[PDB]
Amino acid sequence: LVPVYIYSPEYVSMCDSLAKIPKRASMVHSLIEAYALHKQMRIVKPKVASMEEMATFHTDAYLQHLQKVSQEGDDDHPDSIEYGLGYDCPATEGIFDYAAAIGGATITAAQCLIDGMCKVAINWSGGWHHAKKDEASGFCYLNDAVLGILRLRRKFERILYVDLDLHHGDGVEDAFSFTSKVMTVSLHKFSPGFFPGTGDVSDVGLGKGRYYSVNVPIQDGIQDEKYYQICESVLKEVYQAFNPKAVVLQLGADTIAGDPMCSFNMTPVGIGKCLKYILQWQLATLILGGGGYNLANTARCWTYLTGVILGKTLSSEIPDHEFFTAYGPDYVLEITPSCRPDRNEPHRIQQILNYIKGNLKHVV
Ligand SMILES: CC(/C=C/C(=O)NO)=C\[C@@H](C)C(=O)c1ccc(N(C)C)cc1
Ligand SMILES: CC(/C=C/C(=O)NO)=C\[C@@H](C)C(=O)c1ccc(N(C)C)cc1
Ligand SMILES: [Ca+2]
Ligand SMILES: [Ca+2]
Ligand code: NA
Ligand code: NA
Ligand SMILES: [Zn+2]
Numbered sequence: 001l002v003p004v005y006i007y008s009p010e011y012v013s014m015c016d017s018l019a020k021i022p023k024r025a026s027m028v029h030s031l032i033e034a035y036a037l038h039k040q041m042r043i044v045k046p047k048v049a050s051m052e053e054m055a056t057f058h059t060d061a062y063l064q065h066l067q068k069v070s071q072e073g074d075d076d077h078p079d080s081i082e083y084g085l086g087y088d089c090p091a092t093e094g095i096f097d098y099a100a101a102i103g104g105a106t107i108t109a110a111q112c113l114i115d116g117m118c119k120v121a122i123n124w125s126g127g128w129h130h131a132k133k134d135e136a137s138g139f140c141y142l143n144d145a146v147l148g149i150l151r152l153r154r155k156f157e158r159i160l161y162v163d164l165d166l167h168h169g170d171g172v173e174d175a176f177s178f179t180s181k182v183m184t185v186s187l188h189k190f191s192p193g194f195f196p197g198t199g200d201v202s203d204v205g206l207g208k209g210r211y212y213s214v215n216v217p218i219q220d221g222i223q224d225e226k227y228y229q230i231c232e233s234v235l236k237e238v239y240q241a242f243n244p245k246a247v248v249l250q251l252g253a254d255t256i257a258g259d260p261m262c263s264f265n266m267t268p269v270g271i272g273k274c275l276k277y278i279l280q281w282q283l284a285t286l287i288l289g290g291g292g293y294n295l296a297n298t299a300r301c302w303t304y305l306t307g308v309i310l311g312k313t314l315s316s317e318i319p320d321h322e323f324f325t326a327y328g329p330d331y332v333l334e335i336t337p338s339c340r341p342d343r344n345e346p347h348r349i350q351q352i353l354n355y356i357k358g359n360l361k362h363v364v
Contacts, residue, residue: 003309004112004121005032005041006105014101015125019092021139024295025125027323031299032124034321035314037306041122044112046105049147054103057146057175062134063096066141070096084136099142102126106144106288110151113246113284120285120309123148124302127250127288129169130196137171138195139291145250146175148286149182152246157181160244162235162278163188164271165252165290166261168199168215172250178209180364183242187231189263190217201352204359211362214238216352219343220263224270226344227255231274233353239281241363247283251275252290253301257338260293265342267335268304275308296326300333 007029015025032038054063065083069091073080077091085091102125109121126148128140149159149172161176163169163186176182188199205213216234218227238244251271255264278285287309292298300318307314316334318327 002118003041004044004109004118005038006046006109006121006123007038007043008045011046011101011105011125014098017094018090018098020090022295024292024298027295027299027326028124028289028302030322031303031318032306034319035303035307037303037310037312040310040312042118044108046101046108046123049100049103049107053107053147054100054142056150057133057143059134066099067096070094083134084132088138089136089141095141102128103142103144103147106148106286107151109286110148113152113286114155119282120279120287122287122306122309124289127165127252127290129163129165129250129290130167130171132171132174138167140171143171143175145169145172145248145288148248148288149176152248152284152286153181156246156284158183158242158245159248160238160242160246161185161248161250163250164231164255164274165250166254166259166263167252167291168196169250170196170198173199173203173205173213173215176209177205177213178207180208180212183212183214183238183244183363185214185216185234185238187216187218187227187234189220190215191219201355211359212242212364214356214359216356218264221265221340221342222344223265223337223342224267224273226342226349227264227266227270228273230349230353232277234356235277237357237360241360244283247278247281247285248288249275249278249285250288250290251302251305253292253298254290256292256294256297256301257335258294258297261291265337265340267337268301271301272305272308275305279309296323297335299323300335304333
């Protein structure tokens with residue numbers, strides 16, 4: 001009944017251990033702990049993913065490469081560019097243990113769901129949706145979202161994956177594009193030159209998986225009310241057509257106003273309405289983080305969302321804690337909307353929604 005919270009001091013240290021990658025995990029946990037929300041949850045220490053468990057999705061060659069680079073390298077390896085390592089996925093020591101930790105945490109969350117320990121299990125340090133079987137991409141060395149889905153698939157026949165990160169969940173979609181057993185639904189920015197470039201409304205999966213991928217392309221500057229209307233429209237149609245047995249929900253906070261991504265104009269309240277809608281299905285739900293690069297804002301967001309999972313309304317005052325100064329100058333939980341135009345034309349949104357509805361008529 002109480003949500004599972006995947007946490008250990010070791011796990012947070014590991015998630016924060018990569019050189020030059022900013023130290024977000026501790027900020028997120030510390031804020032949740034400052035609000036004492038961990039006391040309302042079942043704190044579960046994550047296992048570390050074994051080679052075999054990561055190999056459920058990732059190829060041997062890619063994993064072995066990740067391990068070699070994690071030990072000795074940064075440069076000096078011929079295969080690293082092809083394996084996707086570089087600027088947005090740096091080759092630095094510990095990347096393999098980092099990946100193992102996050103993969104293991106999400107799998108642990110899934111296992112908790114399978115065992116009926118909880119109906120909601122949270123890994124705020126996961127959601128790394130871009131990684132492919134054989135390739136790192138966009139901060140994702142390992143696709144823990146895919147690993148979570150595959151773990152859930154041990155018990156639950158049909159999984160719905162919902163990706164509310166600013167970016168297209170291409171790695172997860174690709175993993176499951178050829179099957180009807182997993183439906184992926186991604187809302188994301190879709191614009192010429194915008195990472196990773198994929199996820200147009202016309203991308204619907206392939207083969208046995210045709211029409212079991214859903215992509216919702218959204219433009220800059222969308223705010224809470226409009227986003228939720230879109231999200232609810234699509235998810236209502238998805239739930240009725242697909243009838244998921246479990247849900248994996250990726251809640252990247254890079255949609256939030258003030259993010260360096262400077263794209264969407266959301267607040268945690270808007271994302272929270274989407275979360276509430278999904279939670280109301282009362283299915284086993286695995287909650288992941290993802291992007292989120294205004295670190296304080298991301299902690300504000302996921303803390304707030306932890307609150308909605310718990311059905312609690314949190315104080316607007318940020319409580320004193322380790323990273324309190326990071327919340328200045330206002331020291332409040334709430335995020336303001338930037339003064340930025342909403343580039344989403346109602347008519348285009350309706351067209352997109354009509355198209356998805358047409359597609360979902362083939363499900364399933
Ligand atoms: C990869 C990504 C986000 C993905 C995501 O959020 N997945 O959902 C954004 C790219 C476009 C980017 O802007 C960037 C910025 C800085 C940087 N370093 C400082 C190393 C590396 C990449
Ligand atoms: C995207 C960005 C800034 C872009 C910009 O445009 N800045 O101006 C910075 C990245 C490095 C970042 O902050 C980050 C944090 C955590 C993380 N993981 C927990 C995997 C991966 C990346
Ligand atoms: Ca394999
Ligand atoms: Ca089977
Ligand atoms: Na997304
Ligand atoms: Na699919
Ligand atoms: Zn993102």
